[PDB]
Amino acid sequence: EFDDDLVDAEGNLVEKGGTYYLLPHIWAHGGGIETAKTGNEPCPLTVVRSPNEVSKGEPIRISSQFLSLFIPRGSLVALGFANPPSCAASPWWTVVDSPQGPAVKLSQQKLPEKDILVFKFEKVSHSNIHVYKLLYCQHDEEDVKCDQYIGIHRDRNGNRRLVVTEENPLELVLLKAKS
Template sequence: MLSPTLLTLLVLSTFTLYPLSTTAQPVLDMYGQVAVNGGTFYILPVIRGSGGGIELAATGNETCALSVVQSRNEVSKGKPVTITSPFRTFFLPQGTVSVGFIDVPTCASTPSTWTVVEGLSEGSAVKITGYDNTVSGGFIIEQGDYIHYSYKLSFCAFDTSVCQPIGTSSDGHGNKPLVLTDGNPFEFVLQKVSSSSSSACTASA
């Protein structure tokens, strides 16, 4: 859990674009290459055997796919996302980021980014734009524990000093939504999406 002081600095960084410290650690993709700020990636699980990459699905009473979930398909890479730091750097630094899918359903609001919605049966879950009862806060990307190139996400609410890791849950219908958890974060690696793959995804949306 981040300290209140560090949380305050990270929250402030969301609204300011001062140059980042030269000691900031860059995020690396699964091949050890520096991830580009605002780049496009697949989010893939470090541990295989319980699902594939991150994608969208309709859960609960949703009539539109607004829930961020881990794919049921073990070999699926999920849907491409962009990950952006508010700092004006070429590389993607660890710390505050915004995350959003390249393509979203036509029934979803645009532009669309990840957010957290509270008061749901599965708890506080990660959704895309479209809900009213969202929690004001931001996502943090940090080094994971499994391998050198693995990472995890946390969500920090602006009105508290609490940051909670993002893990997976089960909704009882085969879906594995991303939710706030007290432990067992979802650890992942990033695979860069080639320009040709990104074009293909857009064409098929």
């Protein structure tokens, strides 16, 4: 039988707990992931995509709920900045409801595991390099259901904000970071 682990951009299994750049499949759609200070936030707590196609963005830790060395693709994962802005209490991304829909943010406090272990990579068929969509998993009730995708919403200021999308899910390739 098969675990079907996540594969990085260079064909190597993704290491659980390892740090990767989250880059667009399409070269022209921007660079890696970073942060921005939006709305009334006191500091950069909004997770966004760099507009710089040359930027690999920040190194992101990818951790599953398991101890395994690798990550089964059906595994829930948490995603965090290896080097978060100083004002975030931890590196981990979380999803916050809003008038216009759920958005991806950092937090000024430490959150429970059930608020950060809310993502899952979904392999994109019809592709040579391993490309993944990024799902958000809301509470089913006693569990979670991964039935929404993360996409990009460009705000009035140009920020390419990561938010729950309904029509154009982003597609990433995971490139191993410095070491």
